[PDB]
Symmetry: D2
Amino acid sequence: MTHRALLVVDYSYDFIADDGLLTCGKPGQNIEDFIVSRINDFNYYQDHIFFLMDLHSGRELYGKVGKLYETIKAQPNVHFIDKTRYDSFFGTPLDSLLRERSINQVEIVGVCTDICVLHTAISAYNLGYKISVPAEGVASFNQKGHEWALAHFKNSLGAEVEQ
Amino acid sequence: MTHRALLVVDYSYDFIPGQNIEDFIVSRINDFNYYQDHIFFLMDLNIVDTSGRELYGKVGKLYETIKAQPNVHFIDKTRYDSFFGTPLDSLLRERSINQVEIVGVCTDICVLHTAISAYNLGYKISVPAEGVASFNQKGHEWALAHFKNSLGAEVEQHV
Amino acid sequence: MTHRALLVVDYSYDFIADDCGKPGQNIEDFIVSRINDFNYYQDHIFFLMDLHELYGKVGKLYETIKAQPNVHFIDKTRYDSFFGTPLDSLLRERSINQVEIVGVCTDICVLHTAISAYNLGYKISVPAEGVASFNQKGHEWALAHFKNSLGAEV
Amino acid sequence: MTHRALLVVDYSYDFIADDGLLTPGQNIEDFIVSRINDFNYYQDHIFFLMDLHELYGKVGKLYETIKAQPNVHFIDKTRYDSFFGTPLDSLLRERSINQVEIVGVCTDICVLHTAISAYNLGYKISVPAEGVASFNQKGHEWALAHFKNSLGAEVE
Ligand SMILES: [Zn+2]
Ligand SMILES: [Zn+2]
Ligand SMILES: [Zn+2]
């Protein structure tokens, strides 16, 4: 699609790495390959990619995602947005940036499924975006919450959730 | 204690363990009215101008008894989140409210979305376990934990 | 690509009749013609009204169209039609990206609504014949603001 | 009970300097300095709000000495309105702020839009006539009366 954007939520060393402060360990690490391939997909079409990061070394992007970001961060289709709450839209210009660019569809990847992803997805929903949350592209430390949130995205938010 | 409002989320004929919380909700409505504290009935707009859209049961009866009072408010909403597209935030700030108690249904949908907006907007949040309910146990329990561990809410099991 | 809606701001008897919005009497006929032109295409029309009945021919036109799917009535609590209302989400639901604003007062309710529309990324049109203010200085200041700062067609 | 913050709107080189890319804002410099000093004496919070797209003169020099303090904040904004797309309202609410004083430029553009949003969000507003300026003297005068008569502001 041409009116689509990728939202990469809080994929930082502190959340993903084993020696990270508030880490998610292995599950957040198991989505690295899928996120890297979603970034390349969007970049191929010069679709817009937003890296959304909690503001507070540890706040650098994790692993291959952080590596890829270093090589594309100057491109006009790549954005880095500091956020102060879990919800990527709260107190940020994200919605206005998407609207400027005629985006009405977001794909959301990152961590955690039932916190920052969920809060971001709910705001995307209220703001009238079409939503995709691929189950291979999100993770949580809480298995019950991960499964709870994927069904919430599908059944309450009308989101495409591909297994 | 002092600067508080009650949000009664979506407690309608059409959505209503919803009947099991009826008595607790009525007592919380009476508790806030017992101090002239502000009570907001938030209702999805559930066809307009129909009987399925009325407040259910004893809660509906109590509402009819206090609806004209200046501490009682009825707000129509268009999404699950009670704050979205409504003047709820502005009405709470007019009245120097920094504390909300949230009751009604469903725990992991309208209550959750309302709680998240409350949280983002800087309100202190209490969601008593006895005053919310959901169609599914796993969502109910997930949401009560979310309220406590992520939103910093008070989620008292017993009052 | 242009997808448009008309915002009719605070065109009420209490603002307009002789019993700040009083020059709103001047614009009755032009507002009616805007509503008729949008309704010819089935474009969406929003009547925005302070929540503290529509004046004249606009009121009589409203009764013959009020039940149609393209006609909406929204209560507001501040000057800004977008504040504390579902207006932005109703526009988004319908893929609207341009709003034409008529009503009163040019430098108050129209001004606050236009700024919100601008911030939310809507293209704006405020025809000079479709807005009034008893404050002629403010009227003239506000129309220049729309054009010069909000990028509006005036 | 009043708890106040200072909003210093768009007092940059390019809006104020004779050579600035999009330039009477020079004449309010000393008054803005005194307001910043007055709020800073009490450790009241001060927010510098700047278009994204450096602070002018004595305001910039003063900022360099206080910028690391917990009561001093720098906020980038993408529209005229200081509240739009920014965490400004959340930062003010976090600190129990209920009143804002607005200074800077231009009276009838970024100050106006900032003030309208503060009004809608329920803040008590002060816009001292000596602390705001605009090229458009007609818009300056219009905007000042608007603050007093529509937004219930204190305009001293
Ligand atoms: Zn954090
Ligand atoms: Zn009003
Ligand atoms: Zn600019």
